[PDB]
Symmetry: D2
């Protein structure tokens, strides 16, 4: 249904979860794909499985911490050298934080904002010149419903996310004259390492309880792949008239009309 064989897609934080699910979806659409992450071994393992599942795959995997501008510049340039100028950028890297206002220190605030903001600023700034040389150029920033609907034990992440949402609109407006669309998704509760971590403190039942307590209308946790599909629609020419917007991937958690 979606044919991205012409595309060169970059995914930051692509070695697991939503990022990996996104990379998988991209290879399947025949796109040349590049992904980065900090952990080299998980990165190469993921890389091997990908090449397995997708024999022809044009795939480039590189260690890179998006918090380091210098690393991001080098990653962008190595991407261009290996696959050509990027046409798609998915900023996924990120790690939520559990804290009330009372529990969040200045140090934790700074860390939270720096992570949520620069994991988007760095890759966008380093790859924009490649994006703006390509047709069907699109950026997708992964975000959470917290950005528009805060939760009590996610005070700092919710506020940082809000900033990043606002930034997506600004980037959409700024880049539109150069042909680059910019959107994001707002995930709800999605199965993750963290949620299996908590479980260890059947699984498909302890989660059902969680979704029931969390009042998720669809009555289950989200799947990484589902987040990936919204990303894919937004990254692809299927949404060519959509920019400066978000797709809700929360299972009906947004109380707002």
């Amino acid at each position: 249904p979606y044919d991205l064989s012409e595309a060169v897609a970059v995914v930051t934080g692509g070695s697991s979860g939503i990022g990996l699910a996104t990379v998988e979806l991209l290879l399947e659409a025949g796109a040349a794909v590049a992904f980065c992450a900090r952990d080299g071994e998980r990165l190469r393992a993921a890389e091997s499985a990908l090449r397995q599942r997708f024999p022809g795959a044009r795939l480039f995997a590189s260690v890179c911490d998006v918090l380091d501008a210098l690393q991001v510049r080098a990653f962008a340039e190595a991407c261009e050298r290996t696959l050509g100028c990027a046409s798609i950028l998915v900023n996924n890297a990120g790690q939520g934080r559990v804290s009330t206002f009372a529990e969040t220190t200045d140090e934790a605030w700074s860390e939270e904002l720096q992570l949520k903001f620069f994991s988007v600023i760095h890759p966008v700034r380093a790859f924009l010149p490649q994006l703006e040389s390509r047709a069907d150029a699109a950026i997708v920033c992964v975000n959470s419903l917290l950005a528009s609907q805060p939760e009590p034990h996610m005070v700092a992440t919710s506020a940082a996310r809000a900033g990043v949402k606002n930034l997506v609109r600004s980037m959409a407006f700024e880049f539109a004259p150069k042909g680059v669309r910019v959107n994001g998704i707002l995930i709800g509760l999605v199965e993750s390492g963290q949620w299996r971590r908590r479980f260890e403190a059947d699984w498909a039942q302890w989660t059902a309880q969680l979704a029931r307590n969390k009042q998720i209308p669809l009555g289950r946790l989200g799947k990484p792949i589902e987040a990936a599909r919204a990303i894919l629609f937004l990254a692809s020419p299927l949404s060519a008239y959509t920019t400066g917007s978000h797709i809700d991937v929360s299972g009906g958690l947004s109380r707002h009309a």
Copy 2:
């Protein structure tokens, strides 16, 4: 997953514009599609063209007034009889209305309100028994950015469309336990009979369709610098109607080419 071969999709107002492009994308995904519309001739013509393009397609088209409760109940009956119980429903908004507040009589207010609300309430109420008996059931209501960002010459339509946007959120929550997801799209300026007619009545005679629409898009400050295409709107609807949006309910997709100023 854009393999909708086992889906039964219903599109109200599907003989033209966004409705028609949605039907095409549905047939193309292999779904069995039913659609209705008022103009019989328009409906028939679009029907035969669809069958040429999609040989072997399971397609049921019937003249229907969605504002008429009884007609809609009958059209739902024929749909289940003809294709089987619906799994997807797409309510394709009637039309807009150009009017400031000062220019909107009581009669125009009523007419606008009833159109936007009942064009959704009737099909939904009628097909709900069907949608709720299926798996992967979804409803998409076609709406406009006017719903959350009003425009001066579209006062009544914006207000009516806000109501429907709100109702979409309610239906999603209410139908959730039964497996039926409910979303909308929010179109911007999208090529249509209205813009086509507006281009016929234009003052700038020197300009052709291509030039006039670009001038219009610039004048409207559309960041993407052009009017939307019905197929683009149809594509967002297809995503929301399909299992690809399986964890998305009570929401909307923006199809306005960057017109929404809200963050």
Copy 3:
């Protein structure tokens, strides 16, 4: 304060409507109000004249769903109190129903009541408002407009339409100096809540205690029901020159119910 103002309050014989009239008279404004029940209209009228001696007060039976009545009410206000500078639209109730429970008739009824209770008085009173200084319209509304609730489907929808209409009127009327804003009430103390308290099973909590636990149970952060006077104070702010750079907006009077940032 508002002694130079002519304030009209549609639906002003009880609840938030009456509370707004009370505040307006207190601010020293000439005040007009309408409602359907003449008996209650006049009882309210009679109490207010006592409470506010020498008050410039005009009260009249009017169904806001009837254009010609609203028109007659507007003409009468001008003859009696002079040209209107402030308009508060309050008329209308809430309807309890799921989507399933809501008939076509009920939908039509709700849409009619919510919309025309605003459209009619605004249209009838605009010419007065647009010849006055410091002219303002306030449309009473509910958080339901942006955050619908399950057993209030039809009302939530019509309220959202009216909310969107407030934005359009603000933008439309601003060249002629008329500001337009609304409020979004949460759970407010009504005779209907008094009803339930009276028949509590079979607690020893007084009104304030029972209402407090009810609020916790409805997860209102502020931990109690809203009082008509609190809605009225926001209306007063929005009606008055104190909010002269505020148009096309809403003030949240829900006690913290809005989940949206």
Copy 4:
């Protein structure tokens, strides 16, 4: 507005909206403390205020709100001098003009730090006081940029959004201890910036009043003029006072009709 029983703290109170807020609180009979970075600016302001309000209970101290210890000492000084604080108002430092392309990492960090800590520090320092008082309320001054960004205010818009989100979380968290929290969203308000821009205009023929009217039309402000600090101050006062006793986790629009959102 009888706030004679109130003790109100205004960070950023030496000029603009902050000073208009300080004046309104004082007219309302409240004990008032404010802080600022420029000593000379703060002193001049403090002095003028005393001449205006003879006998006022007024404390003013230089303080960098980005410095947690200065803020802490300031909060100590406020309590010892005026008594426990019951009202806190956090005035937005200022806006930064640049596009995304124009914003360096450094600019991004200071912009985020400024907007976030200018709220985080005073809240955390004063909260123990606020929760000791009835009718306690916090107001955070913000901009419409938080929900409706503008192209030459990219970093500030995003930082404003973060802070608007935070206001919702703080109202929910502090609600149990009786402290309400809200903000305001200013549009274009007369200020040093605009006076500066007026001073460097092409059309010298236009004076201040004519120029801002034209500017207002150009910016498509429905009310057709720039706001005045006193207008922002009046909305902050409403939100700070018992008049808004059932309002928390919210914002009041003070943009003159610039919000396109219904």
